[PDB]
Design a protein around this ligand. Structure first.
Ligand code: MG
Ligand code: MG
Ligand code: MG
Ligand code: MG
Ligand code: MG
Ligand code: MG
Ligand code: MG
Ligand code: MG
Ligand code: MG
Ligand code: MG
Ligand code: ZN
Lengths: 125, 97, 25, 215, 129, 222, 55, 81
RNA sequence: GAACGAAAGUCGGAGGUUCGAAGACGAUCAGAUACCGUCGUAGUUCCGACCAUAAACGAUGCCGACCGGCGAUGCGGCGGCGUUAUUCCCAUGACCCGCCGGGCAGCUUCCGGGAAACCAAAGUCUUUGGGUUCCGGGGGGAGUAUGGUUGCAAAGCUGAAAC
RNA sequence: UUUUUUUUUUUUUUUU
């Protein structure tokens, strides 16, 4: 029955969303870090929060915790927004894809630079 | 009102289907209404084939099957717990996983 | 009492009432 | 017309992402956006009529002064890279992630918006915004595939929307065409950003390993 | 089977107007049905139309305007004696100056209010508004 | 005397006074949503009636839950009515909640002539009818000096609109004031939705208040 | 928190009792209510990360 | 509607739809006022004017609007020749 | 006005396996003449006559005109120099992708309709008139009494009233 | 496998 309530998890996510720059892997320091940076009106609730946050800490080092992603990963996420390699927008400039798209590219007004040629049977799906 | 659009059976173009005599209660139910299954039951239950695989002359060449057209009616179906209740959108639904 | 067996009792009564009519015509 | 028209460089990119051919099965309202059946069942989407609808959709977004009243949606996660970076270009207020039904209706909600236009991505994967579009009188552009029907869609761009590079190409040439009507860069001049941002990234089975191979 | 073919036509336009379509077909013709649409053309509730000549009995293709809410036929074609049209004015047309009624008078197919200018009257073809 | 609680960008145009009248919203069909909106535009929709309260009874296990169902029908005598239904657990709360929902569904009412073209339009423009439930409430236009010949409840709803004269008809369950008042209300919204032979024109398409005061929306969104 | 009273009322029907309890809210000082905070209600601090990097 | 005294009493003209020619009501909250921008001549630059499209609800539901916009742009003559 | 009309019965004819009304038995219950069990007539079956009822149900009269889609399918017809069986052009088979017609059905849809369930017909309806036949008018008494009429009979058709 | 059954008159709803 370690089935801790919302208001543990409510604070423990706002623990991680404000002051991550003080927390660590350790329980017996964050049990006293929690006092200096929060308002805990109960002494069982001192332990109950602090055991959950340090149990959450071994996931934050490990994987993305969905409720809020930390300030490394936000800008870090942008890092995955602006990764620009400039090679493979396009293949070769003589594409051959379909005999049907030859009737496209001839009859729709172009120069028709790239030839198209495959053939198949018609037993599709 | 209508509990179903089928009204149970699957006589749609016809007027009369032959009844199939049920297996458990032996009440004659027309077969497009009846609950219908087909079991490929093995002739020896699989815990006891390993007895018979090791007590046989052959190199486990003998493996026979027991086919039964096993045929229920809708009263003795739920009474034997095959055809569970569903919900008002779940009556619309088709073949099991 | 079902309308089925209500029709059966009206029938059974009417047949005796019929054989009473034909008796003393 | 006739001066924004397509060139051999445009159709070189379109044919590279594989967005000229669509689904095996169509909306019936997709009659005018098809050129021919093909073996495999795949349908040859004609490309001038995509460009017809890309011609309107750029005219749609620029038509309002204030660009910050454009909300752009993606629920499925091939274009959630695209929407966040498309909005990073022009003026849009991106709603990626989950949609939270009731983003537009209840005035008691906090994260609560009232745009003047909506841009969605996959109309079958986004049924809730298209339903919510009919409540606050707002029009909706959609990047429609063949099997995607057209309830509360206005500007349908025929394409594929199941692919990765297929989707993000449309976002690239839209914003480029949108900025071309804002007056930024010519037709007869090249462009400065390159569409591999907008397209998609997979899990980096390749991306960190291509950076590990380019060590 | 196929009887009262004016009632045939005025369900085709009614089902295409409430569907909201653009142009319709009516697979038989008549000088009844040509002159009835000629009433509707002169008032302008519907657009141009064009009769495809079949050598047997043609068809009519009507470009819809989109005004119509109801185009009906009085089904047995009750005869109309005059000073009984105000009864049909209260009965059929919605307001006091909207809609028309198409009459089969002694000098052709006419209009509701054009009939009492003629002061002749005659049998009904229908109503529209 | 309170501050207006401005929200939703359509209320905020009104406190900029960059919407002239409420007609400038009825063109463009934008959803009116707060009640203080039309209370600004109307010090003439001040007349409302609590039509009927009736209790509804939820059979809960302990006792059956009475909760009251009030009706409020507001009306400008010029032609702006709306009929709201609100059910909450108490008498006073049901009416005050129904005030707001009547202010939500306020609609303009078109009034036309009987058939002479002198002036001062007085009756419904055509034969309309509305259906809500089973009731059909048919309004038939009336001569000048008829009155609103009607059942007592929907006469009162038209008496708050400004119809001088109207013939009525009603078939169905007339014993239920939930339907018979909503089916009356459905028809008098149809007076604009129904066409007319004097509106042939391809229209002009004036600009939206979102469109025209967008620069005024720039300084007021910041 | 919950101050409570019951009183008598003698009316023209018979008698009535009235009960009024009122939950006194917490300010950390005041004759409003008790100075002890609400035990469910756990509030937090603000962040102060506005300035500086290695010089 | 004007009488024989020519009197403007009638409140507003509701936005008649583009394809259906049907009246958009007041409480028909699924209406739309679409606006596609003008472009210039050879320059391909934004004219500061535009053309306004208004569509009604039952067109909007049934998918009919998408045929209606591009054909009205063709009825404008702004999408094809 | 006429013919067809399941099963159940009625009349005579052939035989008569199984099931099996009544019938008799054993249990099981306080009671069982009931379910359950065992034996078993009439019946089931075939041949010539009868009777005309059902949940004879799509509980939706029949003909027609129109108004959304897709996925199939059953029977015909045309086309698709991709296979495969006679011997290989030569025909048809066998699948494969079609388009047409009419058919039993389905999926979805705010076409609208519906009191609602639901309905592509139960839509095109107070914006009411395609043509045409049968019918209901608060529940009970009751398809009962009584008349006629048919049936060998069992019963059918037509059908009240008092209260 | 049962698991059969318990009489009577008695139930008002506006508003600030
Ligand atoms: Mg029922
Ligand atoms: Mg049957
Ligand atoms: Mg009544
Ligand atoms: Mg028989
Ligand atoms: Mg005999
Ligand atoms: Mg004999
Ligand atoms: Mg026996
Ligand atoms: Mg075939
Ligand atoms: Mg008949
Ligand atoms: Mg028992
Ligand atoms: Zn059984």
């Amino acid at each position: 029955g370690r089935v801790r309530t919302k208001t543990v998890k409510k604070a423990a996510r706002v623990i991680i969303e404000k002051y991550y720059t003080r927390l660590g892997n350790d329980f017996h320091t964050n049990k006293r870090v929690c006092e200096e940076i929060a308002i805990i009106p109960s002494k069982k609730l001192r332990n109950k929060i602090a055991g959950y946050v340090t149990h959450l800490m071994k996931r934050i080092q490990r994987g993305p915790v969905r409720g809020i992603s930390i300030k490394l990963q936000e800008e870090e996420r942008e890092r995955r927004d602006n990764y620009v390699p400039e090679v493979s927008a396009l293949d070769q400039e003589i594409i051959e894809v379909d005999p049907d798209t030859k009737e496209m590219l001839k009859l729709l007004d172009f120069g028709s630079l790239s030839n198209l040629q495959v053939t198949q049977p018609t037993v599709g799906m | 009102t209508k509990k179903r659009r089928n009204n149970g059976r699957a006589k749609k173009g016809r007027g009369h289907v032959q009844p199939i005599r049920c297996t458990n209660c032996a009440r004659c139910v027309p077969k497009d209404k009846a609950i219908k299954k087909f079991v490929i039951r093995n002739i020896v239950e699989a815990a006891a084939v390993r007895d018979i695989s090791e007590a046989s002359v052959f190199d486990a060449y003998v493996l026979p099957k027991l086919y039964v057209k096993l045929h229920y009616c809708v009263s003795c179906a739920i009474h034997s717990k095959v055809v569970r209740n569903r919900s008002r959108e779940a009556r619309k639904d088709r073949t099991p996983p | 009492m079902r309308a089925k067996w209500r029709k059966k009792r009206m029938r059974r009564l009417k047949r005796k009432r019929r054989k009473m009519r034909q008796r003393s015509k | 017309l006739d001066v924004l028209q397509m060139k051999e460089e445009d159709v070189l990119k379109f044919l590279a992402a594989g967005t000229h051919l669509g689904g095996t099965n169509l909306d019936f309202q997709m009659e005018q956006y098809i050129y021919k059946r093909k073996s495999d069942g795949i349908y040859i989407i004609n490309l001038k009529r995509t460009w017809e609808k890309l011609l309107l959709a750029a005219r749609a977004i620029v038509a309002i002064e204030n660009p910050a009243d454009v909300s752009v949606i993606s629920s499925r996660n091939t274009g959630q890279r695209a929407v966040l970076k498309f909005a990073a270009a022009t003026g849009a207020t991106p709603i990626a992630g989950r949609f939270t039904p009731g983003t537009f209706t209840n005035q008691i909600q906090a994260a609560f918006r009232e745009p003047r236009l909506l841009v969605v991505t996959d109309p079958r994967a986004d049924h809730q915004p298209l339903t919510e579009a009919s409540y606050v009188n707002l029009p909706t552009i959609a990047l429609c595939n063949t099997d995607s029907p057209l309830r509360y869609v206005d500007i349908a761009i025929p394409c594929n929307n199941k692919g990765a590079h297929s989707v993000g190409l449309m976002w690239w040439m839209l914003a480029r065409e949108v900025l071309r009507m804002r007056g930024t860069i010519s037709r007869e001049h090249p462009w400065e950003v390159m569409p591999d941002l907008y397209f998609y990234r997979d899990p980096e089975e390749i991306e960190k390993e291509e950076q590990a191979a380019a060590e | 089977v196929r009887m009262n073919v004016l009632a045939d036509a005025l369900k085709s336009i009614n089902n295409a107007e409430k569907r909201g379509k653009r142009q319709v077909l009516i697979r038989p013709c008549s000088k009844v049905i040509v002159r009835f649409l000629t009433v509707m053309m002169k008032h302008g509730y519907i657009g141009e139309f064009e009769i495809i000549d079949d050598h047997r009995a043609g068809k009519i293709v009507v470009n819809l305007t989109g005004r119509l809410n109801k185009c009906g036929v009085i089904s047995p074609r009750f005869d109309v004696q005059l000073k009984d049209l105000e009864k049909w004015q209260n009965n059929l047309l919605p307001s006091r100056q909207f809609g028309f009624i198409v009459l089969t008078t002694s000098a052709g197919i006419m209009d509701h209010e054009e009939a009492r200018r003629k002061h002749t009257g005659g049998k009904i073809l229908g109503f529209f508004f | 005397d309170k501050e207006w609680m401005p929200v939703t960008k359509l209320g905020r145009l009104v406190k900029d006074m960059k919407i002239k009248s409420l007609e400038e919203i009825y063109l463009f069909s934008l959803p009116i949503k707060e009640s203080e909106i039309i209370d600004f535009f109307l010090g003439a929709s001040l007349k409302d009636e609590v039509l009927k309260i009736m209790p509804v009874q939820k059979q809960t296990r302990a006792g059956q839950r009475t909760r009251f169902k009030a009706f409020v029908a507001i009306g400008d005598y010029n032609g702006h009515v709306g009929l709201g239904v609100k059910c909450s657990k108490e008498v006073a709360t049901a009416i005050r909640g129904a005030i707001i929902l009547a202010k939500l569904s306020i609609v303009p009412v078109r009034r036309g002539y009987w058939g002479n073209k002198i002036g001062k339009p007085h009756t419904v423009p055509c034969k309309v009818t509305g259906r809500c439930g089973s009731v059909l409430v048919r309004l038939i236009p009336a001569p000048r000096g008829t009155g609103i010949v009607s059942a007592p409840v929907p006469k009162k709803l038209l008496m708050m609109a400004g119809i001088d004269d109207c013939y009525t008809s009603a078939r169905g369950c007339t014993a239920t004031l939930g339907n018979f008042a909503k089916a009356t209300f459905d028809a008098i919204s149809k007076t604009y939705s129904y066409l007319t032979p004097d509106l042939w024109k391809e229209t002009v398409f004036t600009k939206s208040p979102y469109q025209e005061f967008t620069d005024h929306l720039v300084k007021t969104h910041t | 928190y919950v101050d409570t009273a019951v009183r008598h009322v003698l009316l023209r029907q018979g008698v009535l009792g009235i009960k009024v309890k009122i939950m006194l809210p917490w300010d950390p000082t005041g004759k409003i209510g008790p100075k002890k905070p609400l035990p469910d209600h756990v509030s937090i601090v603000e962040p102060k990360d506005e300035i500086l990097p290695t010089t | 509607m004007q009488n024989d005294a020519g009197e403007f009493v009638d409140l507003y003209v509701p936005r008649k739809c583009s394809a259906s020619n049907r009246i958009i009501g007041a409480k028909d909250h699924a209406s739309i006022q679409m606006n596609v921008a003008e472009v210039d001549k050879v320059t391909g630059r934004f004219n500061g004017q535009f053309k306004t499209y208004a569509i009604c609800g039952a067109i909007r539901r049934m998918g009919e609007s998408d045929d209606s916009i591009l054909r009205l742009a063709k009825a404008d003559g702004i999408v094809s020749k």
